[model samples]
Target chain A: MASMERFLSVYDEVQAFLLDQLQSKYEIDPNRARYLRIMMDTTCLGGKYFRGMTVVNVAEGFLAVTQHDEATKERILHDACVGGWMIEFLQAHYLVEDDIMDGSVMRRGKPCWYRFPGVTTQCAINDGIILKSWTQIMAWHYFADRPFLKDLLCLFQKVDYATAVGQMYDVTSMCDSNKLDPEVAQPMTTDFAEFTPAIYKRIVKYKTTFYTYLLPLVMGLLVSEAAASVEMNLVERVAHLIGEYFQVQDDVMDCFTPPEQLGKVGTDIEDAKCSWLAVTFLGKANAAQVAEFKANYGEKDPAKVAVVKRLYSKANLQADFAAYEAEVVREVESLIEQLKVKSPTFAESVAVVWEKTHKR
Target chain B: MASMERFLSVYDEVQAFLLDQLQSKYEIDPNRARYLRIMMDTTCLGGKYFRGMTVVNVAEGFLAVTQHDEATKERILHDACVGGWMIEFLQAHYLVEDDIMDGSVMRRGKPCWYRFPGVTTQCAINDGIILKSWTQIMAWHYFADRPFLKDLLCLFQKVDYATAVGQMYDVTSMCDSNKLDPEVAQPMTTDFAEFTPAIYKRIVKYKTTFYTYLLPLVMGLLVSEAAASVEMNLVERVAHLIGEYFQVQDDVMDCFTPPEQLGKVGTDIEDAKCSWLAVTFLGKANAAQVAEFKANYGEKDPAKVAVVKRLYSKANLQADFAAYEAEVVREVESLIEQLKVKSPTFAESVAVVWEKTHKR
Candidate 1:
């Protein structure tokens, strides 16, 4: 099947399963339940379904290769789909909270959940909490009898903890970074000192990589009948590499990609995010250019934002980003190719991840 | 052991276990680790330790009566303590977020965590998230091999969902109540119309009863050798009764208790909380007094606060409160006396909870 074709298959099933769980288990009043259902539909539906779709596809492909009976395959396939929706729920939870934390105004071409009328940071925070806990319940209901239940729970916990650590670093570094420059008229919140290439790598490796690239891959691998054939260390290393590469692309897009293409206008500059584009240009720029960069960055004014963009253009970081993307994609493909020695199913499943990610 | 003596017995150990987990498990640097340690110590410490103590005492008492060997008893007791600390962590998480929502300044006689220097609402929210996830990790690590792990996870998830629902109602009702009187000079956030006795009961039942009263008892029963002997329905029903009664006392104490004694100024009036006192006085006040109540309620002004207090005093709520307290105490004791038929140790352990709560 074609890439987009694969996304649509079983998509409706995931939604129906989610709604079924919501209706049967929540015990909430009708009005409350309806609101929650809308919260789920609004936030969880629009994503590319990359992480979730990977779970269903990988599970289907992995299970097909095994000699398991038809009934068993169907049972595990159902389990995988439930787990797939769980990943989406976790993603929704993270996005809602992350949007609030970053003060993001738009997500998936619509107003962020917190920006919706009658919604405040508090409601978004609580709703996000509800969504996350609901994911655990979904997993428990679907996978309770499976032997891999502990493994699934442990994986989710570790990923969440790593993401939080990365988040803590992201927020704490920004706060600490701002505190260092005491002489600025307004706080030097957009200072480039902390957005060094090394710290940027650390931040994305945990924040975006684990949950986004690795978690779905790992979840698929763990549930596959060929689970024992794969080496987790290699799997983890490969996933991290792809994830870091993926985030770097995102940073590159923040400056270069048009808002219409990316779904939201890049707010990294205004929000003072520790983006790669910012760090790369700062590394190469002269002292006066650095001063100009500092003055223009972290401003809400369009003119000032354009000035930072001009600085990036002057530094020729666009060409640098293209070269970096090509190199990273090649490296991930090579890594995925190596997985063929242990399990072709694992190699093929992960290769599909590369295909989807490289497209965007 | 004396009731208070039981609280101190494993108190320091629980803190140590938490600190150890923070250091060993989380993959953060030394500085971040230190910050989290203080966060845990500051918020997790100094609570009455009611929930944690109940876990320890009940687990110890229940384990002793069974024919299980000393080694098994010791192992389960340790597990119970870990689970006990999990409850405290959840409580700390709830309190930090609750304080922020209530715009609270003080908690346990010190500035709220969000009010602490250099801490933002963001940090408190994130920290609370960490505490909650850590509780899950603590549970999984200690009880991964146990047979009842699924039951334990389900219990925790349900309690959290219920609490979130209760919190949802609490916030929505306040926001909704503020909307009713559009012509008031200022927003009457302290509107008394929403705090019906029924709504107050619902809020306290989910918010306080489950986590505070029922969760510890349920945790003890699930892991004990007496796990099969006790009926969860009866145990849940009794614990909830005690919990509701406990929170009703809290509502009474909120209006009557001093800031020094309560450890924080009562903001139920200002925050327009659906408190028991608010509902009770609203029910009894004459029409003229009700008009006065409506105008003065939900205000920050000292004189308005005094006006509401005078109305409560005039309605003779103090005498009514004394009567209610006596009746509740008698009913809870009667419930405990009935529990003696199932397991003497279970009855004794729960009775300890009643004794401690009844005193305050």
Candidate 2:
């Protein structure tokens, strides 16, 4: 909780640092600086800071184990905060562009950044680019003197590339086979052939896990100089297992949970997303069920959406998801048990993340 | 000429390298990899390669002075080629996103990447993200073991941030002050206050000059280990001057040159762009002429566009531009002469870039 508090406090300093640097270092106009500040506030803030907190938590764990001097502890914590916020900045960059790509209207209980006044699609696109730029700027500003700066930057770049590729897979999986005509209004469609569990896992691993789970943990290790204390392969495996569990839970909740409980309505069905529920149902359903799903899925009509939900329930997807979730948790726990021998602190760090992922 | 050939050849190897790495290194799906290859071919290739060529030229110049062994020469040339192509990759990333923001229809004698079948706005956005990712990926691939790798990545990051900020200025300069209604059609309107020469220079410097001029030269210097041999301040000054001259010429040609000569119809007037000509004319025009210019500029009507053109002619912008161009050439030549005293080969490299900038 103390680390979380420290992480949250860094946001204000980051906003001030970026604005000052833009004007003083880059000579950005005050008006443009103001605009960028608004963009940061709107898109980058208001997140749960879950990814960033993981960085802070893991770094703290490592610090405790290593027992660095007070000055060194403070320095590492500050570095950890910046590292955490860099992930958040990266997330904001993706959200801005993704909203435009997905035609999303709302985010974090407000209109999407692109939907804001004076910031339609055009400005939003540039804003997204700027948001991404901040990640590197922050990295250079905070970690430039560190010997591991190159590794930190390369890690960010690698994750960024993977996420973008995963997004490509996700977009192509649901893209209408018939090329879109700008003049025509067509409903979204899915390619079931691309919705197998293997592909689904690929998308989740690259798109969600690398950034959300693995990046923060690795960053923590790097900052604390504990990266060599544990097997990186084990860290990666545990991250992937947790990521798979996390995404599958999301897919199951989108259907079973109410919008009021979730804080937003789930549109996976209408959007024709390659959700785990849909893939599982398709794999197990009868021919008639498959036909019915094809007819009703990806439709905006309320009746059709309801029909898809009923099909998910009839397929007993809830029970199957529960079993899958249990298996993933078991595997992750077993891996953490193995990790405990090499670095108990690292294992505890990952354990804390695992606990948060299932908090809902 | 040999360097240019080498630079061009690197493009093919880059394409193969990226596709192979995506599948083998990252486990990317073949379908996704193929899609990225098409994106690269469409958006990255066909550029004049002036930016990349500058890197090759400057690096070659340094190689001549340093007079390394044959194998070392080969190694440096290969590094130069990769560095140059990284600039090209960065350019392609900007173009893909810019096309979407500008709603452009054609690029390089073909439809913009976003306009292609099966790749509408959504896919184009992701493609742009991927293109930007390649700049970092390529840098890491080529220079991961080099001591200057961090500096190379930071330079790219700096330019990326600056360009994005410049784009923000450009977009905001022409954004309609009144908030847009997504359902309502609105024309872009230029804000005269934001159309000053200072702001115009800022836009051109950050958006055009940094990536096109400074990046390649600095990249060449970094790769050749000649960065320490020259005054970085001189390199930056010369780059800014050359960039200003180049952009002013572009603005002049956009109006004075015929469509057949310019390869594309001029849209700066109708698009409400903050071009050098517009800013210069505004600075010199009388009250009546200013009012007239304001009314006609930024309108899509043919008659309005014609009226704006006549005003430019009446103001003798052609004669003024010629004078300005002459002064710029004189100043750059003088600097190059000064540069020759320090390093004649470096001067020659800059001379070649200057020559190509004015060739059109």
Candidate 3:
């Protein structure tokens, strides 16, 4: 808790630095500059900051094991904070665009940036592009002189590509041209035939895992120059494992958690997302159950949503999720145990992520 | 003409390379992969190869001034072609999203990518993102081992940021809350109060000038390692001079050129774009003329559009534009004369762009 608090304390400073650079270094008109300031604050803040904190915590772990002097250590930590915030900025870019794409209304318990008054879809689209561009600008500003600059930039680009590809898979899996409407949010249609475990895993790994898990850890390692000391193959494997587990938890929570507690309404059921819960339920269902599930899913009506929830309960999904969570925890612990011998610092970083994932 | 032919001959090969990389290197699903193939072909092709060819021609000019083996020269030319196509890819990224934001219909004489039968706004948004990401991936794939790789990547990011900022200024200047409709391209309401010369100049410099004129020349200079030999200030001055001139021509063409000749329907009058014609006409008109112009400027009615066109003729905009063109030609030639003393090779490069800009 203390470390997380410490990691988040630097966010405002980072935000100020970005905004200052946008105004002073770039010749943006005053009016547009004001719009960007609001856009950044609205979209980039008020999140859990989990991805960013991971970058900071992992970098600190590696920094502790090294012998940098106090001044050097403090500078590197600042760089790590900037790196951490870049992830947050990248997330904001995705969320702003994703909300528009998914027809989502509320995000983080507030109206999505695109849905705000005075901000039309046109403004939001351009704002999303600017948000994405900020990641690169921030990277260049801080990391340009570092030896790992190219590596850091490339990592960002690669992960962004992977995430976009993942989004493509997810969007296409749920897309029905006949139901698509530009003016309002509509319930999407799912093709169960395309909802196999393979497809679900691909979407989860590419869309959720790489950016959420692997990127932060790898970014920290790159910043600390500790990437060479760790086994990259093992690091990738552990990321996939943790990322998949985290996404499964998200899927289960989307169905089971209260909207107030979750801080936003869940639309996985109505959006017909290729969720792990859906895939597992299909695997275990009989013919009649499958038909019933198909009928109740992907509908916007509240009654139909309630029916889907009831079907989840009838299938004992909560208990199944609990078991899966426990099993994955064990598997990840075993992998970390192996990682411990190779690089105890990296193992500690992975352990921190594991603790956060299993909470609640 | 021969050089442009050579530059375009390699485009298909470059397109093939990008598509092949997406399919083979990334684990995208087959369905989404097909969508990407179509999206890339739709948005990235059919434009004049002017920007890409500039990169090729400038690089070739530098190469002719240096000595290398035939095989090595051939390899660098291929790399230059890839660099050239990457700019095209970046342009497509902006246009796809721009079409969505501007509510544009026809592009390159075909329906905008977002308005295609199967491609929704959501798909186009994601595709726009993927197209942007490809520039970086292609940079990494080809320039990873090059000495100037970081410079190239940073250049791309900076130019993209400038263009987006320019776009924000443009969008907000023309935004009207009541007139916005997501389902259709409503004519925008222009805020003439905000459309002063300073704002117009800022928009043109940041948005059109940087990406269209500066990027290709700088990319070529970086590739040839001739960036050190040229006066960057001079390069920028020439770019701004030529870019502003080119955009003024575009404004004139939008008002005067036939749809068949221009390849897309003009919407500046209806969209209330901050075109040179609008700004210049407003500056010259009397009170009655200004009121009439305001009433007719942003209306979607054909008669209102014709009224705005007639006003352009009344102000003798075409004759005035011809005078401006001749003056800019003299100014650019003087700049090139100075550039010839510093680097004759770069002088040739600037001269080629001047020829293209003045041909119409």
lDDT, each prediction? 0.75, 0.84, 0.81
TM-score of chain A of 1: 0.90
lDDT of 2 at B99: 86
lDDT of 1 by residue, A1-360 (tens): 343454444445555565565557434445555556677778888777888878877787777578898878767666666667778888888888778767787887888887766556656677788778778877776677788887888888888877776776766655443342112122445555666888778788878888887788778766664568688887888888888878888888877888988889987887677888887887788999999988888889999999998888889997878887888878887887788888888888888888877778
Q: How close is candidate 2 to the true structure, as a TM-score?
A: 0.95
Better of 1 and 3 by TM-score: 3
For model 1 chain B, the run of ten residues with the poorest summed lDDT: B177-186
Ranking by TM-score: 2, 3, 1
TM-scores of chain A across candidates: 0.90, 0.94, 0.92
lDDT of 3 by residue, A1-360 (tens): 365565666666656766777678666545555666778888888877889888888888987789988888877787787888888888899999999888888887888888876787888998999888888877888777998887888889889999998887778666543444332243455447766777788888888888899999999888888887788888888999999988888888888788998778998888777788788888788889889888989888889889888887798877777788788888899989988987898898899899988885
Better of 1 and 3 by DockQ: 3
Q: Candidate 1, residue B141: CA error in Å?
A: 2.5
| iRMS per model in Å | 6.7, 5.7, 7.6
Q: Which whole-number lDDT from 0 to 100 does residue B43 have in model 3?
A: 83
- Every candidate's DockQ is 0.28, 0.44, 0.40
Q: All predictions: root-mean-square deviation over Cα? A: 4.2, 3.0, 3.8
How well does model 2 score by local distance difference test? 0.84
Would you estimate the TM-scores of all the predictions? 0.89, 0.95, 0.93
TM-score of candidate 1 on Cα atoms, chains taken together: 0.89
Question: Weakest 10 consecutive residues, lDDT, candidate 3 chain B?
Answer: B177-186
Best-matching candidate per lDDT: 2
What is the C-alpha lDDT profile of model 3 across B244-325, one tens digit per residue? 8988888888888899887788989987888889888887889888889988988899999999999989988777677778
Question: Cα RMSD (Å) between model 3 and the true structure?
Answer: 3.8
**lDDT digits (tens) for residues A17-103 of candidate 2:** 999988887777665666777788888888789988888888888877676789999999989999999999999999999999989
Error of 3 at B7 (Å): 4.2
